[PDB]
């Protein structure tokens, strides 16, 4: 219903923030070997709730910092 995207958390050290590395797997333009491409997306995490290495769902919102334009809807797994 809403555009949403899931990623693993590279880091949570940031106060009230998380660094999320999301993986997207693609046909390759010349050859055709599908290679993983990752983005160091800055994500707003309230509560400083998540933990480093967790898997988590994320949705975009109005920009909120110099680098953070996304906020987390919910977490999928836990207890990493």
């Amino acid at each position: 219903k809403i555009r949403t995207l899931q990623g693993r958390v590279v880091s949570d050290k940031m106060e009230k923030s998380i660094v999320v590395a999301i993986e997207r797997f693609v046909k390759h333009p010349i050859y055709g070997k599908f290679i993983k491409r990752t983005t160091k997306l800055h994500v707003h995490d309230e509560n400083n709730e998540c933990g480093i290495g967790d898997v988590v769902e994320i949705r975009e919102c109005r920009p909120l910092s110099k680098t953070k334009s996304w906020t987390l809807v919910r977490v999928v797994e836990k207890a990493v």
Binding site: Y31, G32, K33
Partner: protein, 129 residues
């Protein structure tokens, strides 16, 4: 280590019928029998069978016409190294349709001619003339 059954299934046929053997055996698996039957079900091999309990053995019967191997060129196209998928409109041709291409469509593994009739795209397993 071994990293592909199908390739080893194929060459075993190729090198097998190269030595003009009668029937070549290899450990069974779903894809294999799925693959293997399509040959006979197309006429590429005489017949096949599975033997043993808790042990996988596939023994398929080759065929020769006028002292000549019935299959002549068999190439695994989608490889464990690089995977290959083709949309229905774009399913290739082998020797201008004289050859058959094995395509794993979502509904079932089948011949590309049937896949075009089914209007379905799939992973191109291999070629055979």
């Amino acid at each position: 280590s071994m990293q592909d059954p199908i390739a080893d299934m194929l060459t075993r046929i190729r090198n097998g019928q190269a030595a003009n053997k009668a029937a070549v055996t290899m450990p069974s698996s779903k894809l294999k029998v799925a693959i293997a039957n399509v040959l006979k079900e197309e006429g590429f091999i005489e017949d096949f069978k599975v033997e043993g309990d808790t042990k996988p053995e596939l023994e398929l019967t080759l065929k020769y016409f006028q002292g000549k191997a019935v299959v002549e060129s068999i190439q695994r196209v989608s490889r464990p190294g690089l995977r290959i998928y083709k949309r229905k409109d774009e399913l290739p041709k082998v020797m201008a349709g004289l050859g058959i291409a094995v395509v794993s469509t979502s509904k079932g593994v089948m011949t590309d001619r049937a896949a075009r009739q089914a209007g379905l795209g799939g992973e191109i397993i291999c070629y055979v003339a």
